[PDB]
Amino acid sequence: PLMGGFGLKHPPPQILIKNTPVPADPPTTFSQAKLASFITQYSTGQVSVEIEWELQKENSKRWNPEIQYTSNYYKSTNVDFAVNTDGTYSEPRPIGTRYLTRNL
Amino acid sequence: VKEVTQNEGTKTIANNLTSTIQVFTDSEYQLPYVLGSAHQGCLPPFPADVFMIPQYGYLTLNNGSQAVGRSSFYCLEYFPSQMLRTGNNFEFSYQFEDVPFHSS
């Protein structure tokens, strides 16, 4: 994929969910028209997704230290990757996946 | 292994029986792989020639002459290597992965 990712011929199936329609009271005389009146309704619940990942461990003879991803040492008004005073979670920066080096 | 020493203008060469040499193969390909650039120093075509062994070096990421943060340094003494005196010998065997025939 050009956005980056894992191209999959059979990706994880997409899960579809819908509230079953519940009709409001029909008339007492029969009518062929479909029922256009429903009870206003919504649903809530919990969802768990669990992915097992396989890792390729870094094995390298490089003598000097690697570059690592580290948080800023200096003081700040609020912590990065944490809620603010109002309770809003924010992500300060995009975090790329490549800090390690290999030989080309 | 031979020691050579200079006295005034005369040169003299003598066996050093207790000295060693260090030999290792990089089986795991953890070093910059410097073969395949068509450098000199291969075994001579004609078997009666004696050849000098070329010096090993490698290049790393640069900006101008200066080094960047991803530049790697490799200490070769940091691999395991076999040490051989004058009675010792060295051997290893390698098997090529399946590769298509060169079409001649």
Automatic annotation (TrEMBL), chain B:
How is this protein named in the record? Capsid protein VP1
In the record, the note on similarity to other proteins reads:
Belongs to the parvoviridae capsid protein family.
Give the highest taxon in the source lineage. Viruses
Which compartments does it reside in?
Virion
Tell me the name of the encoding gene. Answer: cap
